[PDB]
Amino acid sequence: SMVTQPEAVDRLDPLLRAVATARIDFTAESILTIRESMNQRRREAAATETAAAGVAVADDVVTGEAGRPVPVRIYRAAPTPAPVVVYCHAGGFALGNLDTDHRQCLELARRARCAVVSVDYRLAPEHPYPAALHDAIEVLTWVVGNATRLGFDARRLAVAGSSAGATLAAGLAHGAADGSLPPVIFQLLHQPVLDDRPTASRSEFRATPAFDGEAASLMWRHYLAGQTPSPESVPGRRGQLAGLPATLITCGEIDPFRDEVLDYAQRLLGAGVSTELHIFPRACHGFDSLLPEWTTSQRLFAMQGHALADAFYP
């Protein structure tokens, strides 16, 4: 009841305030209930979105050695061979599927003139770290290994994500930098989850609408499942950032993840990584999902499109 009532709503744009009316509950029991309602709503909305965008969409599977595939959704908005982004959706490692960030994927493909391969990674708490990261790696390897047949330019591979999906994208970026994975020329990290260690903004925004600091604590617990955090599970704990791909990193200011975003951006810059950073005013976590037509959400999409397009078409 009162626990669900959100804090800091006065600090949000009135248009966003009208829809950001509830805190999330990120307990395991609540996660099950959210999956059902969120997935039903997003399935319904995704078809309308595809009809409007004019971006070709195809669902496929990357089937693994052990006999179950990782599903993918492939978005194509450029002729073969197209530069390609491997994308991981939001959802705090516990929620979502190919419909969750469908709008974001459509916007990236169209505006950056590229292909996007969105990863339907396995979810916590049932499949904690490193399951989703393994799935993302599997998809990235498949994208590159099959680039000719799929119509991709493997020399122009970017990684991208939102929130917990950006955590996974940052893992792919690290694998490319350390030579464990094929080269990656750009990473796009929208409102990324980066650090299990508490920050001032996590405490300040303990109870903001949509996502908050209390949920962030539960999120890390479900994902780690008792494993000790390390730079491999927690990108913000990586000491040396030199050699990571050029980065676009973005976040709303009324967001528990804001400070870890700022810390990470300063460290990327300090390490000599070319970094574009934006903090969007009067916006909470998930602003572009809550109100995708809002001028601020549109400015985010346009910014992302230009960042990728400049990387892909210098």
Closest CA to 249 of 183, 313, 303, 291: 303
Is the Cβ–Cβ distance between 260 and 203 less than 8 Å? no
Q: How far apart are CA 107 and CA 84, in angstroms?
A: 14
DSSP track, 258-300: HHHHHHHHHHHHHTT--EEEEEEEEEETTHHHH-TTSHHHHHH
Is the Cβ–Cβ distance between 81 and 147 less than 8 Å? yes
CATH number for domain 1-314, candidates 3.40.50.720, 3.40.50.1820, 3.30.450.20, 3.90.850.10: 3.40.50.1820
Q: How far apart are CA 80 and CA 41, in angstroms?
A: 33
Residue 278 designated active-site: no
- SS3 state at 159: strand
Catalytic residue among 222, 285, 288, 289: 285
Resolution of the experimental structure, in angstroms: 1.8
Q: How far apart are CA 125 and CA 26, in angstroms?
A: 11
Contacting residues for 230 by C-beta, under 8 A, at least 6 apart: 237
Residue 285 designated active-site: yes
- SS3 state at 15: helix
- Elucidation technique: X-ray
Q: How far apart are CA 103 and CA 301, in angstroms?
A: 10
Q: Which residue has the tokens 């230009």?
A: 306
What is the distance between the terminal CA atoms of the chain, rounded to a whole angstrom? 52
Closest CA to 76 of 114, 46, 119: 114
Domain ranges of the chain: 1-314
Catalytic residue among 118, 163, 201, 289: 163
Residue 163 designated active-site: yes
How far from the centroid of its chain's Cα atoms is residue 125's Cα?
A: 18
Between β-strands 115-119 and 152-162, what pairing exists: parallel, antiparallel or unpaired? unpaired
Catalytic residue among 195, 255, 259, 288: 255
Is the Cβ–Cβ distance between 252 and 184 less than 8 Å? no
Q: Which residue has the tokens 């390897």?
A: 141
Closest CA to 84 of 188, 172, 22, 156: 156
